[model samples]
Target chain A: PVIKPVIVAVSSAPVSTGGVIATTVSPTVARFYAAITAAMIAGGVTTIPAASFLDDADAPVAALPVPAANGYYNVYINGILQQGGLSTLTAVSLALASGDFVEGTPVLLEVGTFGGDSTLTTQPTISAPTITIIS
Target chain B: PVIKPVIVAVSSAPVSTGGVIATTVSPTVARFYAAITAAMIAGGVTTIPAASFLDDADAPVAALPVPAANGYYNVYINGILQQGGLSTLTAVSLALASGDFVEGTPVLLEVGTFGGDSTLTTQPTISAPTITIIS
Candidate 1:
């Protein structure tokens, strides 16, 4: 008989405090469309000024402004989603860790928006999956 | 006017291989229940052998065997899901980076199962979120 170990029940009880939180930020509608047009125009043969940033390898560097007036952005290094505060995004620039990227590394920047209201609100919480394992 | 940036269209185009893969592992049915029972017994008032690993703060360490016979495991440090091979897991132990955790740090380990058959298979691919920002 095969020892098929099936996960009947599993629970991730809090151990101390994971001391970590996963968050998402969204941008406003106006800014997002502006970035899309910028990327589209820059992707073509035409050389539009301030369209995008290009690296030595000719790969488009994902240097985008915070898409929403009040919302922020998220950064992913080499396809792995990162935690909050690992990178910085503002109206002018998107700055990552000094050694976070290389010549051919894949970088992705996602812009999420929280409404245009200026009221302070709490960020969303992303939790881990809960499952059960049984034999 | 509230500039609500609603995401209308977003696609994650393949960009030079995000060069990352997120994977999960599950042990056989027998082992999973055994470990749970072990953890419960160990957390109790009595001294039970091989219940679970306890940290300095008396928190139960999530040292679990790959829950499935064919499946491996996924490791998350401080709530941020990691790519494959960031940690080491075997039939006996689950080892993480030295500085990845502290007394109050949060660490999560998830075990995902493939199936019962012993056939070689490809792992799942986790892609970045795509969003369109309209101004």
Candidate 2:
């Protein structure tokens, strides 16, 4: 079964206070990132970005492929889940106002799957992205 | 006027699953790390690891210099504290019997000091060390 991996395209926008938004992308998205990163670390490619790359040629693309019909995911921020949606590539954006940079350490990204029993199957993968001012 | 910085040095152990215990160092630790890292990022250098470096030259050392006698800290596991003692480099460690590894993303470290009003002063600093199974 071809399970589409989730892609979270995060970029920084100029804030008056020279800050960047640091918020959770989505549960499903977080889980997908976790799974793919983990599997990659473990030599497994459970999920992969839909586009081979993020450039003009691959720009304007969806994150990943569709997972099994019953596949789903839950996104989270710092361990708290964001609302709504399940399944393959999910899209989530945070509205970080000025003076709201991720600062210091990077924010964490997690991705996982909802097992048949509705429990979060497999441990979630984690990654950090500290948004900074672009000067 | 004097202020002490926070420090978090995490080590790893072997687990039957070859997995290193990967949990939050502590909230106090996390906040401390975040503040220091943030300050450093802001050109503040809020905290500094006490005793300098790790080695017989600095081994058998305490993590950092002490804050006011009334200082306090909250240790955490990924995001929670371990409990007991404050006002300096708090010591806390996880027990990973054997065969466990941190795998992939490195674990994070944090440290900080308490402000007079009781609120955490400054942001925290963050560092990661991936624990691997040592042959």
What fnat does each of the candidate structures reach? Answer: 0.00, 0.00
Weakest lDDT window of 10 consecutive positions for candidate 1 chain A: A27-36
Q: What is the lDDT of residue A127 in candidate 1?
A: 41
Restricting to chain A, the TM-score for each candidate equals 0.35, 0.23
For residues A11-79, what per-residue lDDT tens digits would candidate 1 score against the true structure? 432211111222222222112111222332322232213335443223444445455565456565554
Instruction: Name the best candidate (by TM-score).
Output: 1
Over B1-135, each residue of candidate 2 has an lDDT whose tens digit, in order, gives 664333222233211111212111111211222211222222222223443223221223445333335334333334444343311243332121222223222122323332211221333222442332212
lDDT of 2 by residue, A48-108 (tens): 3443223233243445333333233333234422222112243432221111223222222
Candidate 1: tens digits of C-alpha lDDT, residues B34-64: 1222232322332112334453356554445
- Candidate No. with top lDDT: 1
